[model samples]
Target chain A: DMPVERILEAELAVEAADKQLFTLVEWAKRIPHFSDLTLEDQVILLRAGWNELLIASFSHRSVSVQDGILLATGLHVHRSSAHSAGVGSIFDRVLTELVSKMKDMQMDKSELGCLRAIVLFNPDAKGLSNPSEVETLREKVYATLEAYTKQKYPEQPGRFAKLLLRLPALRSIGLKCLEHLFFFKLIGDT
Target chain B: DMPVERILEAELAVEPAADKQLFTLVEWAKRIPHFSDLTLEDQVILLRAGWNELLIASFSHRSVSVQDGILLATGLHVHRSSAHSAGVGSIFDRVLTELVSKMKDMQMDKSELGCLRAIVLFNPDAKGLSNPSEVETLREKVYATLEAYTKQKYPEQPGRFAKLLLRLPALRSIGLKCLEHLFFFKLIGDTPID
Candidate 1:
């Protein structure tokens, strides 16, 4: 059973998560050619990748799942959080493993930004009017991320593949799991 | 293997089945409050964003894990194999299956589905809304109402509220695909989605 104080704090943390979404959207809008896409395509790309954006941003921000999630927004959902009051232990387990892997990469700001760009310009997102156009933009992002990794981490030849492989692992976590932790999710006696 | 020439006819013929069900939502919404309060233009935008949502809800609402197929409103049953043959393709099949599975997992009661349908309809992020804030306010009202209901009714399942709303993305996922469907413009060409 969660203490009332802990529940209130978890809700506050989630509210911050919602607030950070605006900044994530803002950050994407400023990407080199992001604005060139049509409104729906832009909407499509972001909605599909929004969860991954949070997971990756959480990893880059040194979000700790030590006792519970200390997410990118600095919202602390400690162990025995509101969600425990609500099926939440699974989320923390996978994220803890994944976040540690990401932190080990020891990336700088540009690499994280590049990773965000690669996710944001998904060619495979449903409802694109011009997928090839999206594919090209994604290609540009990967090239930049690839070159930057090679330059920044000269001895780490496998850096790019290692980073890219995390995307699939991230996908396994599911958006439902992320939004519940990061949004104003309230779990009652359940 | 599925028959080819037969599949071609089925593909060409499927649009009509969609055409009939497409008009039912507006009729249902006509009696609904808040939806009608919007200007006709805004109504179209909301529908463009979520018309397929109603269809999915109606399907999942009645669905009891069938042995193989789901019967849509038109009595046109769709199976996993049919999803491929109908050419809605892989992701559509996955999203639909995931939706039904998740809906069942959470035990989506009628009120939850009804509230979610309203919440999905009043999407502020949907482009072309003149009074997007108004739509958002209405959305907040419904979600809040649903939250209150879920918390009170299912004290045993407190995370039920969380389990419920997460279905939003998958519901909205099909919105774009549905709007862009080949049957899309022709049905809307008469009166819709500005």
Candidate 2:
């Protein structure tokens, strides 16, 4: 129902979001263009999107719609509990419906690679000295992603648009999580 | 009146490069008066902080139909369904849901939006800033200007400035959320990220 509840879980196979953040730097190092970026730029991008990175990776792997969102430490967020609180609907939809789509797409490594690159190398990310240069890198990844989608899912001509589109939703969920964190704090309840 | 396609054609009376729309943000930033006066580095910082918020404003006015979930393009009705089929997910719908509803409620004018975009862009606290105070001053100037404009244009609602300023945090929140998706998309790899 909230970030705290979600945050506490680690009783499962997948690492919790907080734990995931620590490992992200190493994971990001593997991106083809990540090393090309200045160390400062890399840090800026990582810090800006750490939580987002965690959710995206977490959703891709752990969430299962059939029973519930299979979270860390064997914590099963059943559908009813998922939607019980004021913020429950958000979790319910993201955990179940959104996860189901990821499962359906069966997103692969290279595709995930391109998506990650696109996310990290944002020309619009605050504090980049060279946005056009960043955009160039982003476009390359976009091009590669487009090609990968076409070749991998030959039957699905519209796959490229679908993948590009997921980004806006991913962003929305991330913000909601942050806002929820603040909301609880404002109430001053321990 | 006419088909949605015709409306889209009218919308794209200039040129029809969809991707170009994303990059044109630089052009819009350059046009903001006094923006070019800032150091190039500062200019870049402002653009980074403000681009997505401005993009939302632009989209709300020209492209998205909040009621229909349709992205009005040149000769096309880009439905949310297609976006979902490609795994665009509900975040797209949610942002639109909030944005369109807010715009509808405010009856937002062009000047109000322009000022709001400037305020969002000139955020003083943006990460990686070399000149925080200068950006902060710029943000204040924009905020003051917005305050005056809203007082003049929206005299009935004195709370307009507060309402508009509130949207900035929300925009930042949304931008971060998108960043997470990229992070996840990368980490979900079976092959280790090198």
Candidate 3:
């Protein structure tokens, strides 16, 4: 009975923490008007954030269907080459740190999956006609996400990984449509 | 009975006519982007549709309140002195004529109040140092707009008088802003615009 109560309390604490995290995140979306960030950055950012946290935890859990869904959605996102937040060195800072983190993860089959998920909007990736195919090449994106999760939180990777699936779409639905119209968004993705 | 039926028919037709008019207006908004034709004619052609419409309508209506707001928010109304429309003349013509027509209709003191009401943006007066004097200036502009409207509709006489109004205030808000900001400063210097 005591253990059951303890588990319930833990779950409630986790839920509350998740809500607080979401609230903190909404403020990051409020950078200056012309900085190297944009409204559409939320798309792949969801994936990137998940990846970063998973790597930090280090628990190699099995991939889930939901994980693949997140990665797929990330790759589909596109926004105009320009964002209101002005694009350049600031965006580079974000992607550079993200890429470096991904590189340090040191996965066994790190060839395509890790690179594809994080590098979809990379400058060198431009001129590729079939972005769909380029994205599809990262079939192991979910597996990589799981592995990275388990590696970090070796004791309870599954528990932490579940948190990723629980969060709601933090942005407005109109963002998907608005950002889609502005493809090849170079402004804030750096 | 016949007269009543005819009146009912005319009333029934109004909605469809209004819909068509709105549809055309939306199309104009899309193609023209901004409501500024005179400024666009110079080369600053690719502003967002909503931004352009607000800027043009507000200035022409002499809504100095909106003008001051825009000036603070995003510099000046006619941010650029010219535009090229990225290449499309017929697109340009339809929009230019539409804007001029709407402008003529909106001017305050036109002989035909109905025509003026149809085109006018229903603006309140401007604020700041430009407030009181700007009201008097707008009175002059309404007269100028009426003069141009008559020439465009009935060009029997030499309408060269109205041409004087168009002389420099091609894009009124920006030109006036320049006069206020640059010219009113006691003529301290002479500069060239290329």
Candidate 4:
């Protein structure tokens, strides 16, 4: 026998987060040639890259938030507020680091679009039924980005690798704490 | 008054709301022209003196989504009880409800929010400006911009520009130490709100 006291506070947060997540789903669905992978692989890609994609795009959302972060559901958070919000002040440092790093890269629209594809096609995401299919997408995206950067800034040969190198930062931040900061509250027991 | 136990719970719940209000002010300022050109000292003074009014604007802007209650910047939908649950007693709560309703009644759009936010940020009465005239000019430019915007956009409401400006004073009296006071009674193991 168990006693459960449920409240609506938790679900509204989930629904907001979920609303953003499904928006991601629709985004993935429409990507050029995305559905070439079988249905299960598509599911795996969405699940695997979900948080990573969110974290990366989160930087985009916050491009709208200079020092503060704009939440997935449109809430704006400042580092000052992050503490009282109980989101662990450490995340704001990393959050700013992400924004700062992205700012330094000065990524233009096409490069950002390419970067999104690279994250989506991350073959490293486990349990891919069609690893080679995903791998091919990754290589194609990487090559296009590499070429695009070279053409755009012919003098700056090293830019693409630097761009590719930023993913590790996003990975650590995503797996480390984006959900806990914003959406993982009272997510107790399934 | 009114179950301080739930006060603590909503204190925990509404914290993100508090954080974003402060943060949104700085973020919005970053986008404004000449805000950065203001000496950093003056900028600090303006924000220091005026952030509370700006947050009132923030609450007004974010409240666009929800049904009955204000939608906090953290994406939580806080009804009247939830605001009180965090020690936001009826007095402040009633003023906020009116503030939100009036802003909503105008159906302020993205453009209006941006203009209103800039207008609030550039207060001449703001203490410690190196050149208050510069800030005043900046405010005047913003004032003209917003006035022009309201006139062109809502010609139906001939008095809309003055109406929005009047709301600014109504906000000014509400004051700061707000997020601190709003959720602090329960956060007795208080972290300083500087």
Candidate 5:
């Protein structure tokens, strides 16, 4: 049911400018409660405003999902070692570890969804070379990772069942890959 | 030949109290070079004090290709991916782009490294989860990444001909990872989540 190829394609879709903006939003949104601020605060919020929106939207990403999908449109251009054992193995290990940790925490499915969004929002952990290239890269990689997962694990069901359940954990292991790149993005504001 | 097995053992190696002091020392070492000045204990000087010692000890690690070995260790763990092809890809791509743009003039590698080290010292990004099991898991991951690299590029030759070019970059990558974990560790310190 999951369109694995599309996901991979989606992962690699973005350009530099778009990834910069998207990352800016993710870092900004993590502010705990950015949108609840006064109106004038909105205007002053500027570039980081997108992050506020992302955090708010994850409460119900049905609409945000569409926006996310549209956003990935530009992220699929360059594919780097997608099929390598190193990449796959790291993702598997990290995800497995994260899942174990998540289980210990007793995070609910919805909470897991929020976590997934958080990881997705900060996709540079997966080793994007530059910010402008992130959006397209995300589209293709996401498309590829999703497609690969479905192809590999066909029986998994439910919307984002694999992603929410499997993907976040995968992100954890593979996280080291993007670890620096993501930090590079977040450091700007923090 | 790379002692993949021994390194793995070292990586997987655990003690209950487990070098907590060394961890503290490493954390202290990571702070802005100036933090030592503010403290009465002269913490900064202690870590910096080792510079002179490295000149003599350099021969020991030099044989091991200490610098090269560390660089090779980095390669095993550094996974390269295109920014344009990842989620949050755009953000990282752009931010890095901005960084790269400014890197030439605004900040140099040493400064970048210094800034990152400071942040790691301050943030403590490597705090372990409450469970010992999880901490072990992360260490194992780090070890595996390190092992993978050593296997591929074994036996560092001293002469330029045998020297692997990717090692330096790899080492840089590893240093960054270590710093990141430090950041998480710092976060736990401030938030009182433990």
Candidate 6:
């Protein structure tokens, strides 16, 4: 009974995460240039960069990292609790750092919008049927972000690299989330 | 460079533990709530057919840590001999890398993962099932639960449920790729049938 109950709770959490991800995806689609892509391309990009989009969404909504990750909903998932949920300490560390970095950068809405698109339209995702076309679009978004960073933050020339570098960390966090969802403790016990 | 090295080392350690790995896989599925709800015969059939896909899903996510490799949960790392790597070959390693990367792109939560695991088990197409319709019904129920959960959880994400449903086909593609590698190894008379 206890195990079943725990499973239910986990399911609820997962459902909430999925809901958040869906909302993030819908929001991304409406971005000026994003909506212009063919419907197929849009779907491909969304699926490919869903993890990055979720990270960006969470980063944008987070207020205080001191008392766990406080979101706009008044819900907070404790840093320690995330460990038991299948996320590694490495990912937790990266997330904390990411939150801190976002705070320091004071990312504006347009930059965030452009960053989301850059993450979304990854051409290297395994099943992309049209890599060349996707690559072209991704370059355009990259150019937009680079130009936006320069125009917006003329003082900070390295801002683009800082934002671009976060993708690898985001990928690590995304991979950790997958590990948490599938790996069971019975065999993972070490 | 560091990530690639870690993946290679992990792959090497994984090949030698086939027996124990298979045990862990079966044990993991046995604990899923609805899996035990089925009759023992039905349970066995599903486990036999779906074990590969389930293992692929779990290991890709690092849910069940392999021996000598750190399971991401505890941050503990262990090392084991790479004896099994001889038989398993490079394709096995490659397929796992593909699966792991693919799973990272997906943003499924707990229930979604559970439902997907169930859907794989109750596959109508798996050969030698005693009752295909019964399994189909079970699959439908899981799918329905996911649909209802989507509606209740986030009414604003109208097409969300359908979007998740699309992942099934994507998973199938990965599953088939893994199967191809497994078959190639078996055909070469490398690893014996369990």
The top-ranked prediction according to DockQ is 5
Clashing pairs in 1: A188-B158, A190-B157, A190-B158
Q: Point out the worst 10-residue segment of candidate 6 chain B by lDDT.
A: B185-194
Model 5 C-alpha lDDT per residue in residues B11-96, reported as the tens digit of each score: 22321111213343334343323333333333333333332221112111222322211112112211114322222233333323
Where in model 4 is the C-alpha error above 4 Å?
A1-18, A183-190, B1-194
Model 3 chain B lowest lDDT segment of ten: B185-194
Candidate 1 regions with alpha-carbon error over 4 angstroms = A1-20, A63-67, A82-86, A175-180, A184-190, B1-194
Q: TM-score of model 3 relative to the true fold?
A: 0.26
lDDT pick, better of 3 and 5? 5
Please tell me which model should have the higher TM-score, number 1 or number 5.
1
For residues A20-72, write the lDDT of model 5, one tens digit per residue: 34533333333333233333332233322233233222222222222121223
Candidate 3 residues A92-155, lDDT tens each? 3222333232344432222222322333222223334444543443333444445655665577
| TM-score of each candidate structure, all chains considered together | 0.44, 0.42, 0.26, 0.43, 0.21, 0.43
| Model 4: pairs clashing at backbone N, Cα or C within 3 Å | A62-A65, A81-B19
All candidates: interface RMSD: 15.1, 16.1, 24.7, 23.2, 14.5, 18.4
Task: Decide which is better by TM-score, 2 or 4.
Answer: 4
TM-score of chain A of 1: 0.77
What is the Cα-based lDDT of residue B3 in candidate 4? 23
Chain B TM-score, candidates in order: 0.74, 0.73, 0.21, 0.77, 0.24, 0.59
Model 4 chain B poorest 10 in a row by lDDT: B185-194
lDDT tens digits, residue span B1-194, model 6: 11222222322333321123355545555554455666676677677668667656554456333432324223423222231332444544543444444444554454555566667777877776777787787778767777777788767878877876666665666676556443221112211111
DockQ of every model listed? 0.01, 0.02, 0.01, 0.01, 0.05, 0.01
Q: Chain B TM-score, candidate 2?
A: 0.73
Residue-level lDDT for A126 in candidate 3:
30
- The numbered model that scores best in TM-score is 1
Give model 2's docking category: incorrect
